[PDB]
Amino acid sequence: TEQDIISYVLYPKVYEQYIQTRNQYGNLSLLDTPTFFFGMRNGETVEIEIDKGKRLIIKLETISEPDENGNRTIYYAMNGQARRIYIKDE
Amino acid sequence: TEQDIISYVLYPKVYEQYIQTRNQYGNLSLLDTPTFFFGMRNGETVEIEIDKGKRLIIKLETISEPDENGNRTIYYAMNGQARRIYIKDE
């Protein structure tokens, strides 16, 4: 869009780095600030409000200890669905 | 059975606590001995042998933190079926 075009031209380095981030994590502005800054506790349930009457209901159940490569397994439930994610601990 | 009758007569209290355990955990005598004394570690696959060619296949994935009831959640796979147990941390 036009707003893309002056955005990139005002801020080449930063806009591109923002797209790179939009591509990786989606729309962060929808998250609530505490979630944005801190993530989630064990047992917690957060309700990300996407849109008019559509929401992400996420629960963080547990986080594993890291395997040999330093990857951890977060156990989530998200809209009634067992889900497992892998994050490299740094 | 007659065997129960006589066993109780020999050891009243102790027969009664055997019964109580058997009600709660079933037939422990089928576990391999190291599993019987120590349980399992994170990531381990143990195989309880039942009748010939029917084995219980159990995998321990993680144990959660104790919650505010002091119950830890164990995430298992048993015969390729995800499954989860609440155990009280003492």
**Which residue of B lies nearest to A64 if distances are taken between CA atoms?**
B62
Residue B73, phi-psi category: left (phi > 0), alpha (psi -120 to 50), beta (remainder) = beta
Helices (H), B1-90: 2-10, 12-25, 33-38
User: Per the structure block, which two tokens stand in for B34?
Assistant: 């190291």
* Residue of A42, A82, A89 lying closest to A67 (CA atoms): A89
Is A61's CB within 8 Å of B73's CB? Answer: yes
Which amino acid is residue B39, in one-letter code? G
Count Cα atoms within 13 angstroms, Cβ side, for B31: 15
The two most distant CA atoms of chain A are separated, in Å, by 47
d(CA B35, CA B44) in angstroms, rounded, equals 11
Q: How far is A62 from chain B (nearest CA, A)?
A: 6
CB B57 within 8 A of CB B39: no
What's the Cα-to-Cα distance from B89 to each of A4, B42, B58, B67, B69, rounded to whole Å?
Answer: 55, 17, 21, 10, 9
* Residue of A64, A59, A89 lying closest to A74 (CA atoms): A64
User: Per the structure block, which two tokens stand in for B22?
Assistant: 């058997």
The sheet carrying B45-49 orders its strands as: B45-49, B55-63, B71-78, B81-88
């989860």: which residue's tokens?
Answer: B84
* Residue of B24, B45, B28 lying closest to B36 (CA atoms): B28
């994935």: which residue's tokens?
Answer: B61
Backbone discontinuities in chain B, residue before each (C to N > 2.5 A): none
User: Per the structure block, which two tokens stand in for A66?
Assistant: 């890291």
> Does the A28-90 domain belong in CATH 3.10.600.10?
yes
Fold of B40-90: pyruvate carboxylase f1077a mutant fold (3.10.600)
Task: Please tell me whether residue A66 adopts helix, strand or coil conformation.
Answer: coil
CB B72 within 8 A of CB B63: yes
Q: Which residues of B touch A73 (CB under 8 A)?
A: 61-62
d(CA A90, CA A87) in angstroms, rounded, equals 9
């959640």: which residue's tokens?
Answer: B73
User: Per the structure block, which two tokens stand in for B36?
Assistant: 């019987």
The sheet carrying A71-78 orders its strands as: A45-51, A54-63, A71-78, A82-88
Helix and strand tally (H, E) in chain B?
3, 4
| H helix or E strand, kind and range, residue B33 | helix B33-38
User: Per the structure block, which two tokens stand in for B13?
Assistant: 């209290």
